From a paper:
A key group of these are the respiratory chain supercomplexes (SCs); these which primarily consist of complexes I, III2 and IV (CI, CIII2 and CIV) in varying stoichiometries, which serve as the minimal functional units for NADH:O2 oxidoreduction. Here we report in situ structures of porcine respiratory SCs, determined directly through imaging porcine mitochondria by single-particle analysis combined with cryo-electron tomography (cryo-ET). Our structures, with an average resolution of approximately 2.5 Å and local resolution up to 1.8 Å in the best regions, enable in-depth study of mitochondrial respiratory SCs in their native states. Our in situ structures also capture numerous reactive intermediates within these respiratory supercomplexes, shedding light on the dynamic processes of the ubiquinone/ubiquinol exchange mechanism in complex I and the Q-cycle in complex III.
In addition to the apo form, we resolved four distinct Q-bound states. In states II, III and IV, Q10 takes on the prevalent conformation revealed in our cryo-EM maps, while the Rieske domain undergoes a stepwise movement from the b position towards the c position, eventually making contact with cyt c1 for electron transfer in state IV. To further analyse the detailed conformational changes among these states, we measured two characteristic distances, one from [2Fe–2S] to Q10 and the other to haem c1. Our results indicate a possible sequential progression from state I to state IV, characterized by increasing [2Fe–2S]–Q10 distances and decreasing [2Fe–2S]–haem c1 distances. On the basis of these observations, we propose a model that outlines the coupling between ISP movement and Q-binding states.
Author numbering:
A (entry chain 3O): 22 to 438
B (entry chain 3R): 79 to 110
C (entry chain 3P), I (entry chain 3C): 1 to 55
D (entry chain 3N): 2 to 446
E (entry chain 3F): 24 to 121
F (entry chain 3X): 1 to 52
G (entry chain 3V): 47 to 77
H (entry chain 3C): 110 to 379
Write the structure that this text describes.
């Protein structure tokens, strides 16, 4: 009836909450992502994410697929730049079965040569599907043009590695990035004893911490792209802060102060300062929003903009000017309070869904290692003062920039201007 | 637009049973 | 795994010749005689054999 | 705590009814958030040709302004507490819901009352709103999935109001007026067809007392006497083909007349539908998925996005599939997909029926996760069924259906029934309607 | 004893004279296609040669000299580990079919 | 044609297609007696028998 | 999809880092 | 598979054609062999009797039988041609099988320069033997009694079918039961259809199967023994030799070859 | 311009039949009896005709 953390001697923090829900979700979160990829194994993480049904040590691909389908389960491998989350959710009197299916695919894989070779083609399909939305390309180019190494690595395999990701790279990546110390097993709707039983039964296979990655450095590039789509997706960011600090909370509050996104369908973002500031000016279809991306060792605060090709030069300008206003103390406490309310609501509403709560617990366990109640998170959010937001804005303004743009970039202003 | 298009009226060709817009064709499907 | 109509090597030619053969939509009755010849030939083969039975 | 015990817990959906007709219905479990919205029963079904598209326009102008909240001030409030106000308008139901913290429940219901009762409908916003819809119509024109389902409804329920699109033809939206919208609001936004709903940290007593002192002004009478009645629709098995070779893929949708909301045959048929399942080229299951059609498609790379559907209106529905494949796959897929249906109508096996039951159970349970889906379920169920079906009852119905029941219901709905195919794009291998109807029966049987 | 009989049979079989290893004489059924496709590149590349050379001897209807014959002790079972895996997968599929 | 075809699903499929196959055999038998004009059946029949 | 008005653009501007996800019986998604 | 089934059909129809053609010249042997062979069909229960007059066209092999046999013998070889075309059609989809049995897709050579001349040589070499047959000793393969006007009043002292049918006649006269004889006649040829199923050796080629090779040559000797026995009249010791040869032939095709293949595979780690 | 051997319908069929058909090199003499059969059949088709005109 409550959350229960447990750090076994080999790390591997175990969390479980018996919510008595008709369905239970077991998710294993691993501190292994693109940032831990090196210059020679680029795309390995993407292949691993695409390899969630390959023949494991104790369960052939046919058995895994057929069993999970027969009990009616989903095996998601939700991945970030710094974490990969396996997840299976099914009815209460089934999880045991798929529990094994989750573990064999995460700690005892085989990576058979034929299966990997056949799966290599799926990398192109996934990249093409995921790159239809322009934001994917822009965000990947942003990380490439902002971080020198580590975080710069894309979540998707570069086209020059499609078909050349040998299974040996997969085995090395698993052995050096799936050790017990860097993983967290979370279970919603399952009792803690059985979770501990399966953990110490099999997940103890790979002890240790593993090959640590390298801290990402901030270059400040301007990776651009003239792809020809009418809308110009531009994004201008700067090194904000690492998550888990007062600076991170202040930047998160600043995001809602400027603008977080739509709240009323068929609205106008009247409260959002960025949208209204740009609205005076560009009288054309457009959208703007503050962008906060907090990572384990660094972070990025900036502005994302989608506007008409010709008008883009105004938007990226006008929106930026708005942030400049917040820099030299042009912010009222009422806006701070509204942003705090929006942020608290957004946090308490991400955890609404059971899967969202599972992701929250997984992130807390992987990064911090000690879950904290939403109430204390609200206290931390409230603890931010106006001067801290004003700073944060100063740090963003007087900091090395990083721009990424895609579209007809004829009138897109350059990072120097 | 997709909304603008519509099926032209076929009332000249329909069988007697399926001719009104309120009845259901399931009743007379077996007959036809 | 695949329709026998378009999988069997012998069925390939029959399907492509009489089942899924793209034919003009506005073909008049004057083209029906193309079949009428062939069918008629079979009768001439069918009858003509039986005449050869007792001859 | 096994599955059954968790199903029993299932916090209840206490339902009440104030005098004017509006029925409140809440579901409180623990959560500090809430999703409070009304579910006015209206849509393209209750719309004649002259005013087809009024409902979409009304939903567009709902949040723009009110008599109480002048203009964008309503948006200012909604964003002040961080609420995410939203609205969706199907062919039968149109709903407004606010996703907000439970503490701000008193304000949210007041906001809902203002939007759904005291709407300005101001002329200038109508003119500005006109451009948005027209552009939205082009966006939906590019929505290569949506136009196919619109074609399905147009070519299946011809003549009937169901064929009418939700947005409306791009000629009524250019000739509408405050008069036409005001009649729509007066004739449809009435208390009997309104389900105030909430889920989360919402005490049912709270919702009731708030409804009495905010929504009691809603009337139940209908102008002079005019009451928009129910016009039963007819399923005219037909075919529509919009051949456009420029489009890369070829969306095709085929459906037969499936049951209505009240018909229990939904429970077996869904299981049968779950047998065929769904697939996308990025699934990862590949040639190992238990669904035969999915395994074939992944093995031969036939489709990209085939998926079954069970669109079900009040008295009739559409039951079938929608597949997206290249130009030289349709002729094959119409062979396999139909070839699957007949198999279910002739040789359904309890081994796969158990799998279908499990998939249906997981779909029902997972869909009811989070406050907003719960509120959607409450608002939709009080209208379609008249009561929120508890998950225990769903479990009982799923337990009843077996191989014989699935075979019987598929034979009663699928076998020998004229389809309602609808193509788009480079559809040329798409077998002629004679061929499609030919596949609807198996000569072995 | 058995091994003597298997010696005699291997000598009298014939594929030793043609340079063919034991796993080269498999009748290719539906599973053996997948077995061959599953082979690593080096084994595939040696197998295609061995087969082509043997077909060359047979078209000339000659045999290799005694020295270049595949001995019983030098007959690697390269295909068998993949063949048994393919058979096991097929049997698993058949069991699931019931 | 071995243990593969023997299983609970195959037995159930047999049961499912037994009525159809059996009355297909009935179709074949009726067609055969009709085509051959088999007296040894047709004599026992009603009105048909009056042909002879 | 066509996006050519002020409204439909709203929500397209991402404000959080990209997160990709694929499954076994669910399609690939990004955020 | 399909090529093999089509080949079995070709064998059936070509043997029927040859029987009818041999009936055509209307010698004593022709008429009497026709009577015996058609009368064999009486063994079938119930409707076996009625087929005999239907095929006969009357109450005995007479005018109608000869005329209709001429007509069928004329038409059938074109059916043989059609089935042979389908045979080649089916063969092409997989390609020919080399003596080694293993797939030779890495060694295929074009047909026109190499095998056209090889089959030219083969056809000319066959014509050599055919011309020795026709030109030097034409009636070497055929009963001299055929050169006698057929008379339905005097059975010839020696009765046999042609040299290419005596082998089946041996099994016919082996089984005392008439219906058993006809069933054995059908089965002697139809047993080729069971051969693809009975193959249990992991090798598809008989080059590397010594024991099976000895079995195959024993089968060939069995067929030649059946032919010779069919030539001889049914007396001691030909009767028991015929029974033994029939049993041995069926036993080899059905049992010895599969058991030999199984012990074969056991002998080679598979 | 296209080679008539591999473009004309009848020539294409004949070409795939017995001109450029990929056949194994180690085909022994025993496969010749395939073609010989047809050859005899052709001769059997021929001579019988010349018998049939005086029978
Ligand atoms: C009154 C006198 C007879 C009608 C007038 C005929 C006349 O002067 O001009 C024919 C008049 C003008 O020709 P048309 O309509 O342009 O011909 C269209 C097709 O080419 C030909 O017609 P279609 O192919 O569109 O339709 C078939 C048509 C015509 O069918 C045929 O012509 C073929 C079958 C009939 C035997 C062939 C010799 C005639 O069949 C019939 O009209 C009656 C049934 C005939 C037997 C079954 C077929 O057409 C008709 O009257 C009907 C078709 C011709 C009938 C003869
Ligand atoms: C020493 C004299 C006794 C006979 C020698 C041949 C023998 O019996 O076995 C060796 C051998 C048969 O055993 P093999 O070499 O394991 O198989 C060869 C294949 O049959 C592949 O045969 P091929 O394509 O190299 O052409 C030869 C084939 C030609 O066969 C035919 O033309 C059909 C059968 C004869 C009519 O005849 C034979 O293979 C058996 C010998 C037939 C004549 C006795 O045949 C020859 O070397 C042909 C010798 C021709 C006369 C010189
Ligand atoms: C619109 O075009 C067409 C038609 O009708 C207008 C047709 O009926 C047909 C089909 C025609 C036939 C099946 C009959 C004519 C064909 C032949 C005589 C070719 C030989 C093949 C046969 C099956 C018939 C002879 C069989 C035996 C002796 C074709 C091809 C056609 O093209
Ligand atoms: C075998 C199925 C029955 C065939 C048959 O003889 O039907 C009776 C009918 C009519 O004859 P019937 O009705 O006198 O029955 C057969 C009687 N005997 C056995 C004496 C001939 O048969 C025919 O018309 C042809 C028989 C051969 C059919 C093949
Ligand atoms: C001037 C003839 C031309 C071709 C027709 C179409 C192909 C065909 O004959 O199919 C027969 C079919 C084969 O099985 P089927 O499953 O349809 O194959 C596709 C993959 N499932 O056969 C079947 O599906 C079942 C076999 C027939 C059963 C018939 C039972 C009733 C008795 C007659
Ligand atoms: C036996 C098998 C069937 C017959 C052979 C089929 C394949 C060959 C027939 C076609 C052919 O040889 O055509 C030659 C000639 C066409 O012109 P040419 O430049 O020689 O060839 C260009 C296209 N291949 O076409 C000619 O007619 C060239 C002149 C021939 C002599 C007069
Ligand atoms: C191309 C198709 C054919 C045509 C146009 C054709 C035409 C004719 C004609 C006009 C006659 C004269 C009939 C009479 O005067 O009474 C005839 C007779 C005959 N035909 Fe054919 N015939 C054809 C096919 C065949 C075939 C395939 C056979 C053999 C199987 C055959 C066997 C005979 C025989 C035996 C006679 C003589 C008996 C008689 O006079 O009817 N015919 N044919
Ligand atoms: C009407 C007489 C026949 C003709 C004209 C004929 C024609 C041919 C030809 C030309 C070939 C290719 C050459 C070869 O491989 O031998 C062939 C192959 C073949 N025929 Fe026949 N055939 C006849 C009878 C038969 C019979 C009776 C059978 C057995 C039932 C048969 C089974 C085969 C097989 C199995 C092959 C493939 C041989 C291989 O792959 O090595 N055929 N046929
Ligand atoms: C499938 C190939 C054929 C075979 C194996 C075959 C076999 C035979 C045989 C064994 C005889 C008996 C010869 C004798 O006793 O003197 C014969 C006679 C005859 N065949 Fe054929 N035949 C074939 C094709 C044909 C064809 C296509 C025709 C018609 C064009 C034909 C017409 C005749 C005639 C008229 C006779 C009687 C003349 C005679 O017996 O000397 N045959 N055939």
């Amino acid at each position: 009836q409550d959350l229960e953390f447990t750090r076994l001697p080999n790390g591997l923090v175990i969390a479980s909450l018996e919510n008595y829900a008709p369905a239970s979700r077991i998710g294993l979160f691993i501190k292994a992502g693109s940032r831990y990829e090196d210059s020679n194994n680029l795309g390995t993480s993407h292949l691993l994410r695409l390899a969630s049904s390959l023949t494991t040590k104790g369960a052939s691909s046919f058995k895994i697929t057929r069993g999970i389908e027969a009990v009616g389960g989903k095996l998601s491998v939700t991945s970030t730049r710094e974490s990969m989350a396996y997840t299976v959710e099914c009815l209460r009197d089934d999880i045991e079965i798929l529990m094994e299916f989750l573990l064999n695919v995460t700690a005892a894989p085989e990576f058979r040569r034929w299966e990997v070779a056949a799966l290599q083609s799926q990398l192109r399909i996934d990249k093409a599907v995921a790159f239809q939305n322009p934001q994917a390309q822009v965000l990947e180019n942003l990380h490439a043009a902002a971080y020198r190494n580590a975080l710069a690595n894309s979540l998707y395999c570069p086209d020059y590695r499609i078909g050349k990701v040998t299974p040996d790279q997969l085995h090395y990546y698993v052995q050096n990035h799936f050790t017990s110390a860097r993983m967290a097993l979370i279970g919603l709707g399952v009792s803690h004893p059985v979770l501990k039983q399966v953990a110490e039964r099999f997940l103890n296979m790979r002890g240790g911490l593993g090959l640590s990655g390298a801290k990402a450095k901030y270059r400040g590039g301007e990776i651009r792209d003239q792809n020809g789509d009418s809308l110009v997706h531009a994004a201008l960011v700067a090194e904000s802060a690492a998550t888990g600090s007062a600076e991170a909370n202040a930047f998160s509050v600043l995001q809602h102060v400027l603008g977080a996104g739509p709240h009323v369908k068929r609205g106008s973002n009247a409260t959002s300062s960025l949208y209204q500031a740009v609205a005076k000016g560009v009288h054309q279809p457009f959208d703007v929003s503050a962008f906060n991306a907090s990572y384990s060792d660094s972070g990025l605060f900036g502005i994302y903009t989608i506007s008409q090709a010709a008008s883009a030069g105004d938007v990226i300008k006008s929106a930026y000017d708005q942030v400049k206003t917040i820099a030299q103390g042009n912010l009222s406490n009422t806006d701070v309070q509204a942003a705090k309310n929006k942020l608290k609501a957004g946090y308490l509403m991400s955890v609404e869904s059971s899967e969202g709560f599972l992701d929250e617990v997984g992130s807390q366990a992987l990064v911090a290692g000690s879950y904290v109640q939403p109430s204390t998170v609200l206290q931390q959010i409230d603890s931010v003062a106006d001067a801290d937001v004003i700073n944060a804005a100063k740090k963003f303004v007087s900091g090395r920039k990083s721009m990424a743009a895609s579209g007809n970039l004829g009138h897109t202003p350059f990072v120097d201007e | 637009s997709h909304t603008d298009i519509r099926v032209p009226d076929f009332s000249d060709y329909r069988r007697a049973e399926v001719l009104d817009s309120t009845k259901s064709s399931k009743e007379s499907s077996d007959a036809r | 795994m695949t329709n026998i109509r378009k999988s069997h090597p012998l069925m390939k030619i029959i399907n492509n010749a009489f089942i899924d053969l793209p034919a003009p939509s506005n073909i008049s009755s004057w083209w029906n005689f193309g079949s009428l010849l062939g069918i008629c030939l079979i009768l001439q083969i069918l009858t003509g054999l039986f005449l050869a039975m007792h001859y | 705590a096994t599955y059954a015990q968790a199903l029993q817990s299932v916090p209840e959906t206490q339902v009440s009814q104030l005098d004017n007709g509006l029925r409140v219905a809440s579901e409180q479990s623990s959560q500090p958030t809430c999703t409070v919205g009304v579910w006015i029963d209206a849509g393209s079904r209750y719309e004649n040709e002259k005013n087809n598209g009024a409902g979409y326009f009304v939903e567009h102008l709902a949040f723009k302004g009110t008599k109480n909240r002048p203009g964008s001030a309503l948006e200012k409030e909604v964003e002040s507490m961080g609420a995410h106000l939203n609205a969706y308008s199907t062919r039968e139901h149109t709903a407004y819901y606010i996703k907000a913290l439970s503490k701000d429940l008193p304000k949210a219901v007041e906001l809902l009352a203002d939007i759904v009762q005291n709407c300005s409908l101001e002329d200038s916003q109508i003119e500005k709103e006109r451009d948005v819809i027209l552009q939205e119509l082009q966006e939906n024109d590019s929505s290569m999935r949506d136009v196919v389902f619109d074609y399905l409804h147009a070519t299946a329920f011809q003549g009937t109001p169901l064929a009418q699109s939700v947005e409306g033809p791009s000629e009524n939206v250019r000739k509408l007026s405050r008069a036409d919208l005001t009649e729509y609001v007066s004739q449809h936004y009435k208390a009997p067809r309104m389900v105030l709903a909430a889920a989360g940290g919402v005490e049912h007593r709270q919702l009731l007392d708030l409804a009495q002192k905010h929504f009691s002004s809603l009337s139940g009478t209908y102008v002079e006497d005019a009451v928009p009645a129910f016009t039963p629709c007819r399923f005219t098995g037909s075919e529509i083909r919009h051949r456009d070779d420029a489009l890369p893929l070829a969306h095709v949708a085929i459906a037969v007349e499936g049951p209505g909301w009240a018909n229990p045959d939904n429970v077996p048929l869904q299981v049968a539908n779950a047998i065929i399942g769904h697939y996308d080229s990025t699934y990862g299951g590949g040639t190992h998925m238990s669904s035969t059609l999915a395994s074939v498609a992944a093995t031969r790379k036939l489709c990209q996005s085939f998926q079954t559907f069970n669109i079900c209106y009040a008295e009739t529905g559409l039951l079938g599939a929608h597949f997206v494949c290249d130009n030289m796959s349709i002729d094959d897929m119409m062979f396999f997909l139909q070839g699957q249906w007949m198999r279910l109508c002739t040789s359904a096996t309890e081994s796969e029926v158990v799998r279908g039951k499990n998939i249906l159970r997981n779909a029902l349970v997972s869909h009811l996760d989070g406050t907003t889906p719960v509120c959607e379920d409450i608002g939709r169920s009080l209208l379609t069924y008249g009561r929120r079906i508890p998950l225990a009852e769903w479990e009982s119905r799923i337990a009843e259906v077996d191989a014989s029941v699935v075979r019987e219901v598929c034979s009663k709905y699928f076998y020998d029934q004229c389809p309602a195919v609808a193509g788009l794009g480079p559809i040329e291998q798409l077998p002629d309607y004679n061929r499609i109807r030919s596949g609807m029966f198996w000569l072995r049987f | 004893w058995l091994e003597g009989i298997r010696k005699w049979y291997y000598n009298a079989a014939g594929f030793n004279k043609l340079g063919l290893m034991r796993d080269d004489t498999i009748y290719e059924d539906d599973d053996v296609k997948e077995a061959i496709r599953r082979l690593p590149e080096n084994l595939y590349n040696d197998r295609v040669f061995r087969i082509k050379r043997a077909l060359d001897l047979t078209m000339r209807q000659q045999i290799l000299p005694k020295e270049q014959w595949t001995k019983y002790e030098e007959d690697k079972f390269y295909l068998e580990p993949y063949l048994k895996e393919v058979i096991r997968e097929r049997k698993e599929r058949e069991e699931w079919a019931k | 044609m071995l243990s593969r075809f023997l299983g609970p699903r195959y037995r159930e499929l047999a049961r499912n297609w037994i009525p159809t196959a059996s009355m297909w055999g009935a179709v074949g038998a009726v067609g055969l007696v009709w085509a051959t004009d088999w007296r040894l059946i047709l004599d026992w029949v009603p009105y048909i028998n009056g042909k002879f | 999809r066509s996006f050519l008005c002020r409204e439909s653009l709203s929500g397209q501007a991402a404000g959080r880092p990209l997160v990709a996800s694929v499954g076994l019986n669910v399609p690939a998604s990004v955020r | 598979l399909e090529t093999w089934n089509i080949g079995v059909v070709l064998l059936f129809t070509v043997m029927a054609t040859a029987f009818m053609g041999y009936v055509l010249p209307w010698g004593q042997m022709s008429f009497w062999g026709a009577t015996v062979i058609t009368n064999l069909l009486s063994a079938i229960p119930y409707i076996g009797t009625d087929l005999v007059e239907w095929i006969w066209g009357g109450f005995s092999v007479d005018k109608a039988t000869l005329t209709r046999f001429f007509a069928f013998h004329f038409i059938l070889p074109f059916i043989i041609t059609a089935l042979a075309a389908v045979h080649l059609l089916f063969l092409h989809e997989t390609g020919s099988n080399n003596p080694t049995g293993i797939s030779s897709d890495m060694d295929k050579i074009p047909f026109h320069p190499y095998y056209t001349i090889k089959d030219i040589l083969g056809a000319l070499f066959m014509m050599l033997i055919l011309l020795i047959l026709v030109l030097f000793s034409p009636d070497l393969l055929g009963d001299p009694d055929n050169y006698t006007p057929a008379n339905p009043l005097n059975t010839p002292p020696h009765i046999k079918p042609e040299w290419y049918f005596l082998f089946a006649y041996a099994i016919l006269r082996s089984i005392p039961n008439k219906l058993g004889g006809v069933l054995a006649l059908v089965a002697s040829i139809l047993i080729l259809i069971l051969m693809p199923m009975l193959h249990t050796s992991k090798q598809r080629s008989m080059m590397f199967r010594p024991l099976s090779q000895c079995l195959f040559w024993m089968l060939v000797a069995d067929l030649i023994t059946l032919t010779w026995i069919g030539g001889q009249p049914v007396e001691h010791p030909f009767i028991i030799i015929g029974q033994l040869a029939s049993i041995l032939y069926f036993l080899i095709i059905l049992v010895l070859m599969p058991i030999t293949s199984i012990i074969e595979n056991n002998l080679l780690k598979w």
